[PDB]
Each structure stands twice: as C-alpha cells, then as structure tokens.
Amino acid sequence: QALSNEKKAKKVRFYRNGDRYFKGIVYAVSSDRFRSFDALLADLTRSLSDNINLPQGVRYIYTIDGSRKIGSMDELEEGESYVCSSDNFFKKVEYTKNV
Amino acid sequence: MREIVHIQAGQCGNQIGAKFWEVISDEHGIDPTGSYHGDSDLQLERINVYYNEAAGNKYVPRAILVDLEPGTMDSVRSGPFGQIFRPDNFVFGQSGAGNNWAKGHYTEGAELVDSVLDVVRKESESCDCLQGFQLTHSLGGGTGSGMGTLLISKIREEYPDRIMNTFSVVPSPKVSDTVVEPYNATLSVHQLVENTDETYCIDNEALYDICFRTLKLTTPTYGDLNHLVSATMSGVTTCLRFPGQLNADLRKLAVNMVPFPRLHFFMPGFAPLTSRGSQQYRALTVPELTQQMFDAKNMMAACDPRHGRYLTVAAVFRGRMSMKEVDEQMLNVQNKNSSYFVEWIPNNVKTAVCDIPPRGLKMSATFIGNSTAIQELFKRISEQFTAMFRRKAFLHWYTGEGMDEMEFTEAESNMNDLVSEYQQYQDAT
Amino acid sequence: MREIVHIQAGQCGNQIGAKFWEVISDEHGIDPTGSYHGDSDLQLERINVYYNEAAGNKYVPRAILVDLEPGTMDSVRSGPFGQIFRPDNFVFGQSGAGNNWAKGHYTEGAELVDSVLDVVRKESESCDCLQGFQLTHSLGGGTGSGMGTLLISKIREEYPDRIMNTFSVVPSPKVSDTVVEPYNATLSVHQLVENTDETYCIDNEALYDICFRTLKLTTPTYGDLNHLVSATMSGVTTCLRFPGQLNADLRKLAVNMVPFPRLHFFMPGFAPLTSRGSQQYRALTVPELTQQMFDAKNMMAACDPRHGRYLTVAAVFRGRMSMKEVDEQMLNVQNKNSSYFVEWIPNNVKTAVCDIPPRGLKMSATFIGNSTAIQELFKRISEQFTAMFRRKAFLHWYTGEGMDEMEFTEAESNMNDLVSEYQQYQDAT
Ligand SMILES: Nc1nc2c(ncn2[C@@H]2O[C@H](COP(=O)(O)OP(=O)(O)O)[C@@H](O)[C@H]2O)c(=O)[nH]1
Ligand SMILES: Nc1nc2c(ncn2[C@@H]2O[C@H](COP(=O)(O)OP(=O)(O)O)[C@@H](O)[C@H]2O)c(=O)[nH]1
C-alpha cells in the first residue's frame, strides 16, 4: 500500500505555570517529531520562557486538574490542555478561563 | 491624512518592495540618505501617506518587513535605498519557512505574529486618519502564503473597516517554480476570499512576454521585471498623492470595481511601453494609450479577456490631457467590443485623471480590469490540486504540522464555489 | 534651602553613587577638582542642595559613605571624581559584612553606627532647612541590607517628619547573585515597610534587557548600567534644582503617589532611550516620549504592569514643551487603558514639567509608577524564603549572631500581610 498510517499531530495546549495571563501555544505533537518524551521538553524550553517565568526551565508536566504527572507521550490525549511547571508544587488557578 | 501602511512578506514580496520604495522616492525626490532634494512643493504636500517626518527633516518609509530567515533581509539592508528604512521594522525569525504553507501558518507563524502585530499597532497609532493597508507577497512560497494570510486574518479582526488589498503573485501555468504550489495556492485563496477587499493577481509568465515582445529586452533580470510591478502599484495611488482634475483613491475603487463581496480578483495593466529605439516611431496621444491597455498582450495575468467578459474597468490616467478625448475613447471601446463586456452593467468604465506624469514621461495610464476570464486561472489551480490530492501525495509534510484532510476538502470546495460564480455571471441576462 | 543629604551603603550602593555624583557635577558644570566652570547662573542658583561652599569657592558633595571593609572605598577615592569628596565622610570598619544580614545589623552594625550618626548629625546642622534624606543600597548584600536598614531605624527615631526614600536594588528573579538573598530580602523589607516614606525598587534583570533590546549595547558593563540608574535619580529631583512651569519636589510625590502608609514601593522608568545609530530614525515629540514610558519593556522592575493595575503615576518632564500637548496624552493613555488603571481613583496621573533638559538632549522624561504588579515580586521572595526555611537551611549562620526563629516568623508574616493588601485593592469596587 501507499496511503500510509496517517502520521497526524496531536493538537494539545500547554499553559505555563503561574502566569494567569497566558493562553497556551498549541503544538504539533506527534511521534515523528520527537522520538522520545525527553526530546519534547527541549522544545518546551525555548518556546515558553521569554523574560519572566521558569528559572529551572521545564521539568514536570501536569494535567489541567491537576492530579496526575504525565509520563510518556502516549499518555497525552488530543485536544486537552496541560500545565507545564518546573517544580513538585502545583499552583491551582483558573487556566482554561477565557481561551 | 489618509495614510497607508505597507507590509511585505516572503522572498518575492520583499524584492518587489525593495524596487518599489526606490520608485516612490524618485517621485517625491528622496535621496538614499532620507533627506529631501526635490524642486517643487507638490512633492512635500502629501508626503505623509508613505512617510513619517523624523527629527532633522528626514523621512522614513512606513514599511513593515516580515520574513522567517534573515537571508533576504540582509540583502535589502545591503543594497541601495536600504539605509532609508527603520531598523526596528525588520522582523525576522530563524527557522525559515522551508516552502511550506503549514509551517508558515501554524508553526513559525504563531511564534512570530505577536512580534509583528506590535509593530503594526505602533504604526497604526502614528497615523492621523488611517486609509488602509497594502500587502506585497506571493502564493507560491511558504512565507508569503502562510505568514501573509495569517496577518490578514489578524488585521481584519482588529480593523473591520479599513481597506485591505494585496499584490499577490499567482503562479504561472506553464512553468512551475514549486512542486507543491497547487497546495499553497489553494490554501491561500481560501484565506483571501474571506478577508480581503480587492486583490491584484500578477502572473510571472505574462511579464516575460512583455519584456520580450513589447519592450524588446534581451536579458530581463528581476530588476527589470519588478520595475513594471512597481510602476503599477504607484499608479493606483497616484491620485491620492497628487491633485488631479478627477480624483479617486483606494476606497473609490473598491466601490466601483467590486460588485459582489467575493468577486474581487483583478488583473493590472500599464501603458505606454515602448522599446529603446522604437519609441520615436510612435505618437503619444490618448487613443494611442487607449488601444494598448485593452489588447491581450499587455495584460499582466496569463488569461485572454476574449474568453470571458469584463465586469468593471478602472483607468487611472496621469499627465495633462483633454477630458473630452478620454471620455470619447472610453465610449468608443465599449461600443465596438459590445460582446466582450457584460450586459446588465451599463457604463462599466471608471475614469480617474491625475496631473503629474511619471518621471521622464509626458503621460501614462494604468489599467485595472475585473473579468470573468480569470476563472480559467482558478480552473488550473483547482485541476492541479485534485490531480495531486487524489493520490494523497506531498501530504505528510502538511499532516505532520497538525492538519487534517478536512482542511483540504473545504478549501477545495470553496474554490469550486468561486468557479461556479464567474460561470454564472458570464451568462446572465 | 531644602537641602538633601545623600547616604550610601554597601558595595552596590557606593558604585551607584560614584557614577551618580559624576552625573550631578555634569549638570552643574563641576570639575573633578571642585571648582566651577559653568556657563549660566542657573547652575549656581540652587547649588546648595547637593553642595556646601567651602573656602576658596570650592564645592563638596553632601555625601556620607558607609562600608564595613575598605575594599570599595579605596576604589572610589582612586577613580575620577574621587578627590571631590570630603575625607571625613569615608566611614568604614575592618571586619567586613561577609554577606550576612545579622552581622550587618547586630555585630558590625552596632560597632559602627555611632561613628556614622555623628557625621549624619554634623551634616544636618549644616543645612539651613532640611528637605530629607535619600539612601542608595541593595537588598542582596549584607552591608546595604543590614547596616542600611539599621540607619533608617535610627534616623526615623531622630527625624520623624523629614522624607526618607531609598533606591534599593531588589534581586532579580531568574539569576541569583547570592545563595541567601531570600533571607536578606525578607529581613530587610520588614524594616522598609515600617520606616520609609517611598522606595524605588530596581531589578538588575530589567537593566540587561534595556541595554540589549533597546540601546543595542554589545558589552554593557556596570559603568553603563549604573548610568541609567543615575539618570533616574537626578530626574526625580530635577524640579527642586531648577525653575519650571509646574514644579514638584520630594514632598509632593509622597502625597500624590502614596495613598496608604504601607503601599509605597514604586517602579522607575526613563525616556527617551535611542541607539547609537537608530537615534536619527525617530522624532522627539511628547507623544513619542509618552508611548515609551508605558510599555513593559522600559520598566526597571521585572514585573509586567499588565498583570496588575496602576494606582498612581508620576511623570517628570524636562525641557521646553507645550502643556496642552502633555495633558492631552496623559488623558489619552488613561482612556484607552481603562482596564489597566484602578477605578476608585480618578485622574491618577501627576505631572511635573521642568525647564532645563539633560546634558546633550533636547527633552526627556521620568516615569515613577505605583502598581499592584509588584505583588508578584513579593510572592517570589516569600516563596523562596519558605522553600529554604522549612528545611531550616542556612540558619545557623544567623542564629549564632544572636537571633531566634521568632524573628523570621514575624518577618515572613509581615510580608504575607503585604501580599494580601495589593491583592485586596486590585479587585476593589
Ligand atoms: N516577479 C517576481 N517573482 C519572484 C521574485 N522572487 C521570487 N519570486 C517568486 O516567488 C515565488 C517563490 O516564493 P518565495 O518568495 O521564495 O517565498 P518563501 O520561499 O516562502 O519565502 C516563486 O513563484 C518565484 O517566481 C522576484 O523578484 N520577482
Ligand atoms: N546594578 C548594580 N548592582 C550591583 C553593582 N555592584 C553590585 N551590585 C549588586 O549588589 C548585590 C551584592 O551586594 P553588595 O553591594 O556587595 O553588598 P555587601 O556585599 O554586603 O557589601 C548583588 O545583587 C549585585 O548584583 C553595580 O555596580 N550595579
């Protein structure tokens, strides 16, 4: 065959931690662009911190609720947001309000 | 008042403007430094529309220059008339488009547009009464098709009343400078029919005939091809920068030339075009400038108007001339070509006459034609799209950027709705 | 009259002043010797506020310089404009702070403050009518945080009516120049909210962006970073040293900008800031100086004002300009940013216009902003404090200096009271 396996990208949102006035940049997350889960964090480094956030960079990725630490990329789901923190402590503000 | 903000995008859209701002500085008599060395006070009378007076009686262009790689912006600042720009306006990323529409619209577009719209918003507040925005890009590339159509969808959400016109370069039908240009053109016209007021479609293939058959140029480089496009762009707004007997602007064209909120794709036209030696075997009269604006070999879009019908015709004349002489010829060409115009629109020619000719010439003109003859141009893009899409080739370079096939289907269905509209009004009664 | 005594402390607070007194001597035209070489009599009209006329028509700065080691005071007297000071004012110990707040406040502070307050009391009796005291220190070190806040608690007990303002340097949030700087900043703000009238918080991280993004400096040393701080400090008191159309002083700012006896932490701002070559692509008008004072990339504290609300805004303009032009722009920026200002304070902009510009320029301005956006700055100091205090790390270096944990608990509880206040008035109605 030639019509291949639909190498699609997930359309997921990444709110950064603490910043209430931030919308979350939708990435083209797929298995073709990042061979491991560790390669995704390097893209999260440059395209989230500009001047005032994240002195430690990006370490931990949480759920929007958030009560579960994200493991591999297979634990991601299409069209749901995620809080991108850099510490064990989670800040509980209304991220998804006024997208 | 009535200031115009000029926006450039893509490798093509920058090299057009790099010649274009050389042309505008010639008409107002501006050195490459930025000072003034004119002769008459009419050059400084309406200078504010394309310029801002800086401190020290120096003028800067009100231009915004957008790219994704610095390979072209370095060429602009290195050449002549590169020192005239402001260094803040050169907005550029680092990744490069890679000749990809989805990278220009999703990946590198979203990481750049916020830095662009701050510069757009700064230039808008500097203007007293904003007339509108003009844009120079192309449809074949990934930058001017992706980043350019992203800016129009953001500007129209912030300015739902100002005029918005684009000098896009439609890809030529015979030769193809990009393998995936039916994919780039289809996903761009879907953005242009929703958020633009008028659009000046230019084909490259028509410019090679004019430089060869008419101007008799042996070696036409892009320094000569872009010079014809820049003369057309100045000729549209020449009544806004100079007093004339019968004045028009960018607003009066969108009322006259656009009878329906979708059918707003034009074709340009310039006259006179002599040769280097054959210029003396010719008289410069208004019927001589008339007959050159209507033949098919002077159009800048690769489509013969004889296959279709005109709907509206603009004709911006420059230089001093008799108004009786102009109005009789515009009546004459309508009676003899009574089958080539549409029936249910009487007096379908709009005329504007300025006073100041271009530099070096005595009189000139500018043809802006709307027609049903451009439906053949949208057949070929729609035909070459479905020829490639049915095998789903060159598709994983777009799906991997976060895009589904439903995006392609509705974009192709939008263009076939446009083809049926020009087909319907061609045979109205 | 209205003389000002300038006090310096810490390694940072001395190197700011060592550039600062070079700036003030430029405005009044003073050689490094101490004589006068000006051109106009306006420089000598109000010279007594920062100077004392010695015998022989020589002027000395009314400055007090405090340190715990002579490693920095030797650098001041060795450089240019080091001969201008008086050798009696160089008060310095021998032990050194060791980057420790408790050593600066208990051990070496108590063995030095009596020698300092004799020099303070001598300079106070020399003044005709004292205006107040300004202080230059920093919060990260041990000298300017310990010895500096000890002096404020002694001066306020001797002068409960004079104004007291500090140009403290708040530590930057991303990089950290001291491991224990959350302990030094928390134990200093507990002293600043009780005994100061207003405070100008400056972040280092904001100065690196302004030197790079705006001024386009490749190699910014501290000789260029402290020069921006010194231009801001002179711009606050420029109406007290020169006649103007609308005059203000240090007293009128503390009435306007301080609505509550605790909320007195500011953020500064300076304009215009050109580049070395991009200065010619810009006009020098009041709306051009207006729009640069309010964007987030010109603040000197690392906090975006868009996260919070302004309460009061000062704007000290220099150079000749139309008062109608100033007052319309101050109205204009309040109407369009109607969500970014507080509601229950109408006309929350205070304007003062001097007459004499800075040296070399034609006009300038100075932004003094109070906001609720600095609560994020006090979140981070309070968060990094409790992150270190819950493990009781770096604590025995403070307990061994005679201090209990109850001192830390009430100091941290004072800061969380301050965080709730800026949170409360942000959502008032
Ligand atoms: N008329 C004209 N077309 C040009 C010029 N430079 C490039 N082009 C056209 O631009 C298209 C390529 O797009 P490009 O500007 O490179 O976009 P990008 O690669 O995404 O930045 C092709 O159709 C070229 O023929 C020029 O100077 N003049
Ligand atoms: N802006 C600025 N900050 C300085 C300068 N010198 C030191 N600092 C800051 O001062 C702090 C260190 O405090 P310091 O003055 O040495 O106090 P001490 O060690 O107790 O005498 C750090 O935050 C440094 O970044 C300077 O010239 N300019």
Numbering used by the authors:
A (entry chain N): 44 to 142
B (entry chain B), C (entry chain b): 1 to 429
What wording appears in the published article?
Doublecortin (DCX) is a neuronal microtubule‐associated protein (MAP) indispensable for brain development. It contains two homologous globular doublecortin (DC) domains—NDC and CDC—connected by a 40‐residue unstructured linker (Kim et al, 2003; Cierpicki et al, 2006), followed by a disordered C‐terminal serine/proline‐rich domain. It recognizes a corner between four tubulin dimers via a DC domain, except at the seam (Fourniol et al, 2010). Although coupled, each DC repeat within DCX appears to have a distinct role in MT nucleation and stabilization: CDC is a conformationally plastic module that appears to facilitate MT nucleation and stabilize tubulin–tubulin contacts in the nascent MT lattice, while NDC appears to be favored along the mature lattice, providing MT stabilization.
To verify this assignment, we carried out an analogous high‐resolution 3D cryo‐EM study of MTs polymerized for 1 h in the presence of NN. Since NN‐stimulated MT nucleation produces 14‐PF almost as well as 13‐PF MTs, we investigated whether there were any architecture‐specific differences in NDC observed in these MTs. Nevertheless, supervised 3D classification of all picked NN‐MT segments revealed that 73% were 13‐PF while 26% were 14‐PF. The resulting 14‐PF NN‐MT reconstruction had a resolution nearly equivalent (3.9 Å) to that of the 13‐PF NN‐MT reconstruction (3.8 Å). Crucially, NDC density is equally pronounced in both the 13‐PF and 14‐PF NN‐MT 3D maps. NDC requires only minimal structural adaptation to fit to the slightly narrower inter‐PF angle of the 14‐PF lattice compared to the 13‐PF lattice. Overall, NDC appears to be relatively insensitive to the inter‐PF angle, with identical (within the resolution) polar NDC‐MT interactions formed in each MT architecture. Despite being relatively conformationally rigid, we found NDC still capable of adapting to slightly varying inter‐PF angle, as evidenced with equal decoration of 13‐ and 14‐PF MTs with NDC‐NDC tandem (NN construct).
